[PDB]
Amino acid sequence: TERAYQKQPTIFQNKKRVLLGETGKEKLPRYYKNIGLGFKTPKEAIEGTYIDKKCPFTGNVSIRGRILSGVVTKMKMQRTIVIRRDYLHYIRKYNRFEKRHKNMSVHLSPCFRDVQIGDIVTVGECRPLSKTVRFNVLKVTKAAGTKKQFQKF
Amino acid sequence: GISRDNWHKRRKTGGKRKPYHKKRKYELGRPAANTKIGPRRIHTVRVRGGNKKYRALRLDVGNFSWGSECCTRKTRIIDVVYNASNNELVRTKTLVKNCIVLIDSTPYRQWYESHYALPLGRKKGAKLTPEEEEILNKKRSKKIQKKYDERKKNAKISSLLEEQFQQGKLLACIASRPGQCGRADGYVLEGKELEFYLRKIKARKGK
Amino acid sequence: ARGPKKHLKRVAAPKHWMLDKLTGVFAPRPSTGPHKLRECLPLIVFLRNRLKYALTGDEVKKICMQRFIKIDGKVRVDVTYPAGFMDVISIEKTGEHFRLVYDTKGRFAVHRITVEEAKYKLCKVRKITVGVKGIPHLVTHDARTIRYPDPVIKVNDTVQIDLGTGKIINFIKFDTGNLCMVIGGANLGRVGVITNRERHPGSFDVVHVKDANGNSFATRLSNIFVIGNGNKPWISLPRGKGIRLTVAEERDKRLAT
RNA sequence: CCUGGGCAGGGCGAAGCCAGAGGAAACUCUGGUGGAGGUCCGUAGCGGUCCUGACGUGCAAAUCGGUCGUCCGACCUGGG
RNA sequence: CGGAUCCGUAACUUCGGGAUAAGGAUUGGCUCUAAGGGCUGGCAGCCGACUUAGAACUGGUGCGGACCAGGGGAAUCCGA
RNA sequence: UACCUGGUUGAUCCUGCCAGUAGCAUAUGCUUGUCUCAAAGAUUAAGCCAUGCAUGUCUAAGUACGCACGGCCGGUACAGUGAAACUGCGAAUGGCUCAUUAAAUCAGUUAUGGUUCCUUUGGUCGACUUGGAUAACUGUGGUAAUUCUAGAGCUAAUACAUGCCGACGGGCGCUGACCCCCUUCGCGGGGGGGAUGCGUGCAUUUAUCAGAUCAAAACCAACCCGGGCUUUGGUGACUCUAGAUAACCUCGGGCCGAUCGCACGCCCCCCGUGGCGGCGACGACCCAUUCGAACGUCUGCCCUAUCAACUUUCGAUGGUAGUCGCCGUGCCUACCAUGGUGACCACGGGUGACGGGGAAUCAGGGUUCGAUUCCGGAGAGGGAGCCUGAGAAACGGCUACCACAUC
RNA sequence: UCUCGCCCGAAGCGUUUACUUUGAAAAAAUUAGAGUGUUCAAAGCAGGCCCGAGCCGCCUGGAUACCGCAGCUAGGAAUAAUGGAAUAGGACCGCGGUUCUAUUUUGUUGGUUUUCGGAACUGAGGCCAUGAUUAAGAGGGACGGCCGGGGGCAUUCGUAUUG
Ligand SMILES: [Mg+2]
Ligand SMILES: [Mg+2]
Ligand SMILES: [Mg+2]
Ligand SMILES: [Mg+2]
Ligand SMILES: [Mg+2]
Ligand SMILES: [Mg+2]
Ligand SMILES: [Mg+2]
Ligand SMILES: [Mg+2]
Ligand SMILES: [Mg+2]
Ligand SMILES: [Mg+2]
Ligand SMILES: [Mg+2]
Ligand SMILES: [Mg+2]
Ligand SMILES: [Mg+2]
Ligand SMILES: [Mg+2]
Ligand SMILES: [Mg+2]
Ligand SMILES: [Mg+2]
Ligand SMILES: [Mg+2]
Ligand SMILES: [Mg+2]
Ligand SMILES: [Mg+2]
Ligand SMILES: [Mg+2]
Ligand SMILES: [Mg+2]
Ligand SMILES: [Mg+2]
Ligand SMILES: [Mg+2]
Ligand SMILES: [Mg+2]
């Protein structure tokens, strides 16, 4: 569906299929972009429904530059999440390390489901999407502990 | 004196950044020219690098593309309805990049007659308009070719475009920037987008 | 600052021009041309400093506008015209035909060449495209944009170019086993057979090469100039085969004197 | 003392209650709901600060005009 | 000054207040725009309430247009 | 030079600091024969400036009727030197200073596939010369004057403008009278030629269509031959480049030489009154290289908690459309969601803080400076705005306010 | 895996780090350091050989080392944390059906059906030695024979002091 004023990326909808009268499907003309880099386009971009300007597999967002990895911390921002990159810093004087982290925002494409908090995600450099969002979610890697468990209700 | 700069902003947190530049030249800002629907009037703008930018203060004619049949014709602009980004610009009748224009559907009637003969949109009278409708008599097998164009391609322009052709107005989405290139160029709303914007305009006139 | 830079200091000049500290403050700024500043060599440096033809630069400025020195067949009126790697310098009166190849130390080594090879010239393809009315174009690192080139030319190739007509001939590709010469980085002036290329999706692929007497070095595709076809160099290269032996072997050569 | 009668509208927003956030815990923060009070502006009602105003053989052997204090109470008031 | 809306509110303190502290902006007329509901059906259609916010235009800077209606601040003595 | 010594006690040992010791870099005192290099108004005052200089520029080749010089010199404009001016380019580099500035600038590493780019280097560039305007110049002037200027006359061009010829019309698309073959009594069914009318090229602005790895068949209606045939390139990716389709291409109008010099010969011949024209400076729409800019990605900065919550009506974070900008950007607007950062020190202050490469200090480890000659940033008394120009929010450019300050 | 020309190249490819050895990596000047008798030296990158001027001359240098931390590549797998499967929703082999497209050959064109390349779902059994390191002179919990002026509540007793 759509809850905005227009969502139609590139593909022209009207093939004028009206020759004898049939409803047919409409999910076939979808712009299907492969990012390369040995990274698989997920099947949610094949048989999905979303229309996103900033999607790495649907929109015109070219992935270039650097490939980093973070851990998902928050979800509460619309179509973009905040990751944390833990790293160590060598200090010359005392001759051991310290923990430093920089919380970055990254555009979570709506094809990636099961994006629960605590999984290592791969991010890629792109053009500046907004003021704080420069990276783009590339591949969700970690299963975030155990996925087999279920609880009451 | 408008600066579109990003150094007068707060940081990722919200700490105030200290100003030290003086709003430099490579980050210009020029005031908005809301393009009206009057006659044709386009000024020029010098660009960094010596390029030329065409500022349309008000426009009358435009160039509009039919979607399916691939027929792009010149079209006088009638009215601006449902900009859907700022409802003040609907009242102001301002042409922007993604806006909706009432195409005068006259220049598509002649092409639809010349290519898809036995036309429609003729007020269900069938007695007026000596257009030279049936004068050339369609001598050779190109009459049969037009029969292929009319019956095998079947010419279905189903009831939305039927009612719009009978009313004489047509719904268009602009695809060009009137403030940058100075052109009112666009395409015709077709099918699902057409019924979507028609539902939005009907709901806006309702509530 | 505002606009482009227009002066150039001797201290901020690149090392391979063999300039001085006590002599002058400013360096000869090379004008815009087919070569960037870090990989060029001006004509005033080639004449005043290198061959020792004129003590001052004003004499070089006088003779280059008295129409003696020409580059690639046509006369350059500028005293600071940029030259580059694999160019033909010829001056019109005696046997003085200088190729600009790279010394093993990293300098623009002089090379007097016979006219039968000085008529010709190799050049590396920079990229390939198509243009007006669907015709192909080839862009050279020497800023040669030639139309209707060939269909069998990869991006990283070396094509022999004529100096009189500007016509291409004798293209050679980037294959395992060809003879190449590294032009950039810490291994510039290194002549060796292409041994292995390793592709990377980060748009900078690495290449390991070997040469004679068992030595190997790694470099990048932006710094490789293919020069031959399987230990068969198309251009005669001076001072041996262009090999950095050892600092100790250079000292042993000096002791052999 | 007994028995009846009466007091327009607004402002402040206590306890209690709900939801969200933080914390290991103690608990804390934010946004609502709530309507407490010998609580504030103010009318009728009740008194009378000032003009030391008007009269001052006056309307009147103590009144009148503005300006007033208080007005859910230790409030005002009829009859027995 | 005085009503109302939106900003912003000090010394001190029993932490409740001081406080409508102090100090500013808007307020008219006419067109619009958006939001806040009920009743009928195996997501659609009918019916009415007065509020708020924003925009444009216009009048001789006029707008609480009459009426309604807190001058304020720093202190001292006494009495909570 | 991996270095200690004197000092608390009547005397000893210890913690402890003070004082001596040696460079560094600022000032000062005393003294001074030779020579080679050699810092030098930074610290307080990025306080104020008299005076004099620091940005001008001509090739055989844009414009020469200057009154200035003079070729032999006759006449059919112009031999040449040529002051002055119109034109073009530069004055956006260099030089000087460190006052703001604490993930801001810088430094190492990455990319613009999200942009522009003077010049240079290559591709591209398919009417026997048209029209006004004006300077230098000549006379006339203004006030106390400026690098001040109106008005009278004059003429120029690569300043401004207008604008055809060549070139056959090739080919394509849409219409398109007519025409060829077979069958049907005809109607009709199928295939094949074809004048006129309309658009055509590159770039801009749209919209649509087709676009690369894969090998055996089974039938239905037509036909080419004696069972049997056909195609732009690249990245890791594209909405890249390149095709075709229909229209726009905007008066403040994209290109398709109304430029200039050189030495001069030949040819059909009907004069040459026409061609044969070779080299060289101008940018000329566009495409790449080159000089550099621009906003981005990872990482890195001193002290302070007597700076523990900060940010958001006046965007703080994100999403969707739009505006502006050269392009991606909450850069700006409308609507919607309540986000964003922080005890791993954010936020708020101070720096006698420009950042680096570096400098001083001799075990190692560290400590302290770096305004300073190389790179980058910022400013031209404060801050604001802007023309020209490819490049400036320029200051040895302009405009207005404030403080000084000249006639 | 022989998927693309019995072995070899390419590609499937790391679950991602921390640490190390290469290599690329940048700008010089500066620092250490090679050569060079600037009269030594501070320096600078210069200079040196034969010729009675008679060689229209030759030869060589202007290197190297460091450039932390951060990023890239190729190896190492000890140490330091991370998940493999435990409600089986495990890994392998090959069989059942549903469902979907492209292009090679039937001589081409338009229409239908397959084998075929695999994506998506699903059914049954066999194969795993079928899958949980034993339990710190680590820790938490449970038991049961005690322990103690440990704590709280209520009670009882005792002189003495004062009246
Ligand atoms: Mg309405
Ligand atoms: Mg009270
Ligand atoms: Mg009060
Ligand atoms: Mg009262
Ligand atoms: Mg009284
Ligand atoms: Mg009274
Ligand atoms: Mg009285
Ligand atoms: Mg009286
Ligand atoms: Mg009162
Ligand atoms: Mg009261
Ligand atoms: Mg008070
Ligand atoms: Mg009162
Ligand atoms: Mg009292
Ligand atoms: Mg001391
Ligand atoms: Mg400068
Ligand atoms: Mg400072
Ligand atoms: Mg807004
Ligand atoms: Mg030391
Ligand atoms: Mg040390
Ligand atoms: Mg910068
Ligand atoms: Mg400046
Ligand atoms: Mg000054
Ligand atoms: Mg200046
Ligand atoms: Mg000055």
Side-chain angles (χ1 to χ4, degrees):
Chain A
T1 61
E2 58 184 0
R3 292 179 178 90
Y5 299 104
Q6 187 61 42
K7 289 181 181 179
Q8 188 266 330
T10 307
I11 305 300
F12 186 70
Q13 299 294 321
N14 297 110
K15 198 179 178 181
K16 59 179 287 185
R17 292 179 183 270
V18 280
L19 54 92
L20 290 173
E22 57 91 20
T23 61
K25 294 180 182 179
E26 292 179 353
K27 291 182 180 180
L28 279 75
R30 182 176 293 274
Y31 181 74
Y32 179 72
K33 184 177 180 180
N34 194 1
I35 59 172
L37 185 55
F39 288 159
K40 184 178 179 180
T41 299
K43 66 182 180 180
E44 294 294 327
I46 299 170
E47 61 265 15
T49 314
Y50 66 98
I51 295 167
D52 195 1
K53 184 179 179 180
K54 295 178 181 180
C55 181
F57 298 103
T58 301
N60 54 3
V61 178
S62 65
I63 301 167
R64 65 185 187 271
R66 294 183 183 273
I67 299 166
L68 295 176
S69 297
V71 59
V72 176
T73 60
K74 291 187 286 185
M75 290 181 183
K76 301 299 293 296
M77 184 167 63
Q78 292 85 22
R79 289 182 181 177
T80 172
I81 60 173
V82 176
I83 59 169
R84 183 176 178 179
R85 291 185 291 113
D86 291 329
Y87 65 96
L88 293 175
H89 181 270
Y90 181 74
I91 298 169
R92 188 177 180 179
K93 181 175 179 180
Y94 292 154
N95 202 359
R96 59 263 193 104
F97 296 95
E98 64 184 2
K99 289 188 177 70
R100 289 183 179 179
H101 71 280
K102 288 175 94 288
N103 288 319
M104 291 184 67
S105 63
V106 64
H107 186 275
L108 191 275
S109 178
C111 63
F112 293 101
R113 294 179 180 177
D114 291 331
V115 66
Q116 294 178 356
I117 296 169
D119 51 356
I120 297 170
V121 70
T122 304
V123 298
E125 182 181 358
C126 296
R127 62 180 175 88
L129 277 73
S130 68
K131 183 176 182 292
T132 65
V133 178
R134 279 88 167 93
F135 284 168
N136 197 355
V137 169
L138 189 61
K139 179 174 72 176
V140 175
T141 300
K142 189 177 186 292
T146 62
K147 288 183 178 180
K148 189 177 179 180
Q149 61 90 31
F150 290 99
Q151 300 297 321
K152 292 183 262 74
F153 183 73
Chain B
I2 299 170
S3 67
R4 62 172 180 88
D5 52 356
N6 55 2
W7 59 266
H8 74 282
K9 296 300 184 185
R10 292 184 183 272
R11 297 183 186 274
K12 308 295 184 183
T13 298
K16 186 183 286 185
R17 190 184 182 277
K18 264 64 185 299
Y20 64 99
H21 292 287
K22 301 195 298 294
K23 291 182 180 179
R24 290 186 181 274
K25 179 68 175 177
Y26 62 92
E27 54 192 4
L28 295 174
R30 291 181 180 91
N34 290 319
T35 301
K36 302 291 184 180
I37 59 167
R40 183 178 64 85
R41 187 172 181 177
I42 295 169
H43 295 284
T44 185
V45 171
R46 184 177 174 87
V47 173
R48 295 185 69 251
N51 295 115
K52 188 180 288 185
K53 191 178 288 186
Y54 297 97
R55 185 73 66 194
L57 266 296
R58 53 184 178 179
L59 294 173
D60 196 1
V61 293
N63 198 5
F64 290 93
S65 298
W66 187 262
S68 297
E69 300 293 329
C70 187
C71 182
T72 302
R73 296 296 176 90
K74 195 74 171 293
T75 294
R76 186 174 295 113
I77 293 168
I78 297 171
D79 195 77
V80 170
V81 174
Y82 187 70
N83 196 3
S85 67
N86 192 0
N87 298 117
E88 185 180 1
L89 297 177
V90 180
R91 297 174 66 250
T92 312
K93 295 180 181 180
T94 298
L95 297 174
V96 295
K97 179 178 173 66
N98 191 358
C99 183
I100 297 171
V101 170
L102 275 73
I103 283 175
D104 193 0
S105 68
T106 300
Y108 295 100
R109 293 181 185 271
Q110 290 88 20
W111 183 73
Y112 184 75
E113 178 181 359
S114 179
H115 192 274
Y116 282 162
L118 189 64
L120 58 93
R122 296 291 188 270
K123 73 186 286 187
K124 295 183 289 295
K127 290 181 181 180
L128 281 76
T129 67
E131 188 66 28
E132 77 183 1
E133 290 289 330
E134 293 177 355
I135 299 299
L136 297 173
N137 204 4
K138 266 62 184 295
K139 299 291 184 181
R140 294 294 92 194
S141 65
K142 292 183 183 292
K143 186 176 179 180
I144 302 170
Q145 182 180 3
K146 291 182 184 293
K147 187 183 287 185
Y148 289 116
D149 290 332
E150 182 66 27
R151 292 180 181 178
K152 185 176 180 180
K153 292 182 180 180
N154 206 3
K156 285 188 177 181
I157 49 171
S158 177
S159 66
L160 296 174
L161 297 170
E162 292 286 330
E163 292 179 353
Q164 292 177 0
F165 282 161
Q166 289 181 356
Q167 293 295 321
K169 64 182 181 180
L170 187 63
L171 277 301
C173 178
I174 301 172
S176 178
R177 293 179 181 176
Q180 299 293 320
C181 67
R183 295 178 188 269
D185 297 336
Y187 63 96
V188 177
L189 292 173
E190 292 286 329
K192 187 175 180 180
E193 293 179 353
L194 181 61
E195 66 183 2
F196 181 76
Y197 288 116
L198 186 62
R199 182 178 291 171
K200 294 293 183 182
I201 292 168
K202 184 178 179 180
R204 182 174 175 85
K205 296 294 182 182
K207 68 179 73 174
Chain C
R2 297 176 294 172
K5 298 294 183 182
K6 191 179 287 184
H7 286 281
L8 185 62
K9 301 291 184 181
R10 289 288 181 93
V11 183
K15 185 184 285 186
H16 298 285
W17 291 355
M18 297 298 107
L19 292 175
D20 296 332
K21 290 174 69 176
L22 188 63
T23 300
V25 176
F26 292 98
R29 182 261 176 96
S31 296
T32 61
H35 296 284
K36 62 179 70 65
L37 295 179
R38 299 292 182 184
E39 293 178 353
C40 68
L41 196 279
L43 294 176
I44 187 167
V45 181
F46 182 73
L47 294 174
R48 181 179 181 269
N49 197 2
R50 189 176 297 275
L51 292 176
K52 194 178 179 181
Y53 285 167
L55 184 63
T56 185
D58 289 332
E59 192 72 31
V60 178
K61 183 176 73 175
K62 286 189 286 186
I63 61 171
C64 70
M65 305 185 79
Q66 285 179 356
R67 298 289 189 272
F68 295 101
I69 297 96
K70 62 172 66 175
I71 306 300
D72 290 330
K74 78 280 290 180
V75 181
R76 301 299 183 187
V77 300
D78 195 1
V79 65
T80 60
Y81 181 77
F85 178 75
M86 192 63 208
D87 287 331
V88 178
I89 303 170
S90 173
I91 308 98
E92 285 293 324
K93 189 178 263 77
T94 56
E96 288 177 352
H97 300 281
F98 294 99
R99 293 290 180 88
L100 292 176
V101 297
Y102 287 161
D103 193 76
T104 63
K105 301 295 186 291
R107 292 186 296 272
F108 290 91
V110 296
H111 178 71
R112 293 181 180 178
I113 192 65
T114 313
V115 296
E116 296 293 327
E117 291 85 5
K119 183 69 175 177
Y120 293 98
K121 180 180 176 180
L122 292 175
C123 63
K124 183 178 178 178
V125 177
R126 185 179 293 274
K127 66 182 180 180
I128 189 167
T129 185
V130 289
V132 179
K133 293 180 181 179
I135 70 170
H137 293 89
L138 188 146
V139 173
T140 308
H141 79 281
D142 201 74
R144 300 288 185 183
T145 301
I146 184 163
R147 66 180 181 177
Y148 302 107
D150 274 330
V152 201
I153 293 177
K154 190 67 183 295
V155 176
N156 296 116
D157 295 340
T158 297
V159 183
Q160 188 175 3
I161 188 67
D162 194 2
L163 294 175
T165 62
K167 187 178 184 293
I168 60 167
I169 197 165
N170 195 2
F171 63 96
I172 189 62
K173 65 181 181 180
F174 185 77
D175 191 75
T176 298
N178 289 320
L179 185 64
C180 70
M181 185 177 180
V182 180
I183 61 170
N187 288 318
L188 77 162
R190 186 72 180 174
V191 177
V193 179
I194 299 168
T195 302
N196 207 167
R197 64 180 178 89
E198 290 85 4
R199 295 177 64 88
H200 297 287
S203 294
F204 293 105
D205 301 331
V206 297
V207 170
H208 299 283
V209 296
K210 291 183 180 180
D211 60 348
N213 70 25
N215 288 316
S216 66
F217 286 100
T219 183
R220 299 170 75 184
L221 286 177
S222 66
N223 293 318
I224 298 168
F225 185 80
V226 177
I227 197 68
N229 202 168
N231 200 0
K232 296 290 180 68
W234 294 100
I235 305 302
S236 66
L237 195 145
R239 272 73 175 175
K241 293 182 181 180
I243 183 168
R244 296 177 66 190
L245 294 173
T246 303
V247 178
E249 291 293 326
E250 183 178 1
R251 185 182 65 188
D252 291 331
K253 182 64 66 68
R254 292 181 67 249
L255 290 175
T257 197

